[PDB]
Amino acid sequence: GPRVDFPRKLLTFKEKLGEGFGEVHLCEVEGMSANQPVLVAVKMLRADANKNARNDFLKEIKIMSRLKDPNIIHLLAVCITDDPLCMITEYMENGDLNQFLSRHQPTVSYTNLKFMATQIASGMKYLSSLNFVHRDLATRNCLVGKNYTIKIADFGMSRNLYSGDYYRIQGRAVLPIRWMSWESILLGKFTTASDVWAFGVTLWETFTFCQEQPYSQLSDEQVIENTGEFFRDQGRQTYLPQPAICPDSVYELMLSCWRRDTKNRPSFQEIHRLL
Ligand SMILES: Cc1ccc(CNC(=O)Nc2cccc(F)c2)cc1NC(=O)c1cnc2ccccn12
């Protein structure tokens, strides 16, 4: 797994990339590579730190220290000897996919648009195989590297830019209802098939360039109202429309993700093989 206790003084601050638990910094790993040294993302937990919050961070490492895929974020090192506890990952110079695509209609061709979703299906193909369930697959949870390289991460609700993407249902628990299957927002049934339904919405997002929020005309209460219509299956449900620059075949793939029955949905192996 990750390098246990990397020397902290080997990390040179460049800039903080978020403050959601402590804050995330861009750092230069100083000393002995080729031309440019390795730049990393360092997530350091707050000083105050309550036992449960301290435990939450170590639970994040427990989950993150099992992932090893070219399309999954990578946990390089962990500074765990003395406080603050840190978790070190690689750096995706082009930020998140939602922010990246929003700036394009710059231009990314169909081949390269298809290439980003294939890597997402590839990275998702991995998670399934470890019996892991992402629960929140969206372009905001996708990081962009060099030459359209996509890595899947999990940021939670914390990124305040994406607050109107999560619906508070009980206490501090929030839901990405526009990406979730009916059995996910009715029965709380989380499966690879639920992640597949998120993949169809993540592909829709991609093919729309993150310019339109999923279910634009519907509200946070109209979206949960729509889940029941997917279940009732009486032709009173609304699906995402076919994007303008999306082949008939890609929207057909999109549809199979949103099919009512869990078993009737494609696997990530099927999805990756089509893509
Ligand atoms: C440093 C760091 C630590 C913990 C995370 C959060 N992630 C996850 O937990 N993932 C994950 C978990 C389970 C399944 C899965 F599939 C994934 C992330 C980061 N790193 C960044 O935040 C970062 C990296 N490059 C950039 C560029 C711009 C902005 C931020 N970063």
From Swiss-Prot:
This is Discoidin domain-containing receptor 2. Detected in osteocytes, osteoblastic cells in subchondral bone, bone lining cells, tibia and cartilage (at protein level). Detected at high levels in heart and lung, and at low levels in brain, placenta, liver, skeletal muscle, pancreas, and kidney. The chain holds residues 558 to 849 of 855 of the full protein. Binds hydroxyproline-rich sequence motifs in fibrillar, glycosylated collagen, such as the GQOGVMGFO motif, where O stands for hydroxyproline. Interacts with SRC. Interacts (tyrosine phosphorylated) with SHC1. Changing residue 43 to A: Abolishes kinase activity. Changing residue 162 to F: Reduces autophosphorylation. Abolishes phosphorylation by SRC. Residues 6-275 are cytoplasmic. The active site is at 136 (proton acceptor). It is found in: Cell membrane. It comes from the Eukaryota. Induction: Up-regulated during osteoblast differentiation (in vitro). Up-regulated in cartilage from osteoarthritis patients. N-glycosylated. Tyrosine phosphorylated in response to collagen binding. Phosphorylated by SRC; this is required for activation and subsequent autophosphorylation on additional tyrosine residues. GO terms for molecular function: ATP binding; collagen binding; protein tyrosine kinase collagen receptor activity; transmembrane receptor protein tyrosine kinase activity. GO terms for biological process: biomineral tissue development; cell adhesion; cell surface receptor protein tyrosine kinase signaling pathway; cellular response to angiotensin; cellular response to hypoxia; cellular response to transforming growth factor beta stimulus; chondrocyte proliferation; collagen fibril organization. Belongs to the protein kinase superfamily. Tyr protein kinase family. Insulin receptor subfamily. Tyrosine kinase involved in the regulation of tissues remodeling. It functions as a cell surface receptor for fibrillar collagen and regulates cell differentiation, remodeling of the extracellular matrix, cell migration and cell proliferation. Required for normal bone development. Regulates osteoblast differentiation and chondrocyte maturation via a signaling pathway that involves MAP kinases and leads to the activation of the transcription factor RUNX2. The modification Phosphotyrosine is found at residues 162, 166-167. The keyword Cytoplasm does not apply. It is linked to Spondyloepimetaphyseal dysplasia, short limb-hand type: A bone disease characterized by short-limbed dwarfism, a narrow chest with pectus excavatum, brachydactyly in the hands and feet, a characteristic craniofacial appearance and premature calcifications. The radiological findings are distinctive and comprise short long bones throughout the skeleton with striking epiphyses that are stippled, flattened and fragmented and flared, irregular metaphyses. Residues 11-275 form the Protein kinase domain. Its main location: membrane. One of its GO terms (cellular component) is plasma membrane. ATP binds at residues 17-24, 43. Keywords: ATP-binding, Cell membrane, Disease variant, Disulfide bond, Dwarfism, Glycoprotein, Kinase, Membrane, Nucleotide-binding, Osteogenesis, Phosphoprotein, Receptor, Signal, Transferase, Transmembrane, Transmembrane helix, Tyrosine-protein kinase.
